[PDB]
């Protein structure tokens, strides 16, 4: 399987070295509806006039990015997203900027956030959770092979496509790094202990986060939760986890090796690398090639009533996009 990661790295390296730029403009798109709002702006359903295709457009306010000192991370986000290519990663179709904003135009993933199905249904059965888990396992194998750390795994960042497969989105904290890095970033419930302990960390954080995700999918609640972040960090650091009685012994054993506080012993971080995870008993029944090919039939298929259909997303309050007559932060975002 390592030979296709080879071909993969080569395309990535070309794109990483010479990133595309300015591949569309705002007036090629009609804005329809907000799919989500975030720290620096929002994501909207848009429709491309010439083709009639629907896309999701992430809009970032340059000024807000600068205030929250997130310039570098924003540049990472776009540079990495335009270089990667994988069945479970969202595809960036276009990017451009104007006087006020940065725009990333992706494929529209119509099934909604994993988060919303999760909360509604309550929890996923182990066979259902495993199906999603396998996709993430292959995705992290691809990303880590390119020296990338993802750092923001959570149900709110995973979208379900029309086939019931996962699309990973939000590369805001993705970073290409050989060696360790130090930034405190991510989402509190999913933070690995070494991040909270300001230790200097690596790709092993993503495997911890997979641990948290599988627990949340199968239990319906996260292994560590409280009302305030600080209380959550205490729990994560202690590393004491309890499992629901319904968890299979195999699932409990996988989780104990992913939610390992000592990096020395955490799965995905040992000599056998990701093969320790792929070969664990919980995955005994998993056909990795089948999944990779999307030949496996999803356990769950969102309702979809024609394209442009947004019924699988919450409604948000809409805001018109304002563009200044003066260029803001032009130097800072030159490369975007």
């Amino acid at each position: 399987v390592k030979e296709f990661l080879a071909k993969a790295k080569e395309d990535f390296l070309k794109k990483w070295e010479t990133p595309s730029q300015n591949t569309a403009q705002l007036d090629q798109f009609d804005r329809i509806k907000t799919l989500g709002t975030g720290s620096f702006g929002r994501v909207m359903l848009v429709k491309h006039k010439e083709s009639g295709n629907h896309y999701a457009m992430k809009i970032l306010d340059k000024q807000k990015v600068v205030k929250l000192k997130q310039i570098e991370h924003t540049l990472n986000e776009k540079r990495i997203l335009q270089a990667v290519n994988f069945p479970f990663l969202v595809k960036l179709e276009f990017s451009f900027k104007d006087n006020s904003n940065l725009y990333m135009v992706m494929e529209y993933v119509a099934g909604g956030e994993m988060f919303s199905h999760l909360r509604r249904i309550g929890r996923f059965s182990e066979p259902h959770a495993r199906f999603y888990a396998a996709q993430i396992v292959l995705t992290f194998e691809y990303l880590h092979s390119l020296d990338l750390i993802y750092r923001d795994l959570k149900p709110e960042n995973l979208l379900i496509d029309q086939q019931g497969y996962i699309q990973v989105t939000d590369f805001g904290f993705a970073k290409r790094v050989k060696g360790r890095t130090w930034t405190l970033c991510g989402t509190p419930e999913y933070l690995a202990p070494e991040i909270i302990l300001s230790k200097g960390y690596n790709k092993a954080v993503d495997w911890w986060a997979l641990g948290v995700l599988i627990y949340e999918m199968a239990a319906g609640y996260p292994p560590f939760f409280a009302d305030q972040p600080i209380q959550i960090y205490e729990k994560i650091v202690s590393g004491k986890v309890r499992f629901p009685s319904h968890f299979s012994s195999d699932l409990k054993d996988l989780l104990r090796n992913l939610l390992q506080v000592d990096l020395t012993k955490r799965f995905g971080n040992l000599k056998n690398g990701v093969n320790d995870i792929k070969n664990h008993k919980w995955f005994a029944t998993t056909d990795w090639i089948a999944i990779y090919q999307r030949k496996v039939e999803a356990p769950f298929i969102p309702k979809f009533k024609g394209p442009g259909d947004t019924s699988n997303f919450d409604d948000y309050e809409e805001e018109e996009i304002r563009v200044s007559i003066n260029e803001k932060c032009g130097k800072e975002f030159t490369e975007f």
Binding site: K154, E156, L184, G186, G220, Y221, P222, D227, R242
Partner: peptide, 20 residues
């Protein structure tokens, strides 16, 4: 139950990232 405790907690909706 743990489920009851979670559902009564303030962090059952969409969770924002932290930038620090």
């Amino acid at each position: 139950t743990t489920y009851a405790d979670f559902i009564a907690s303030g962090r059952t909706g969409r969770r924002a990232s932290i930038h620090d």
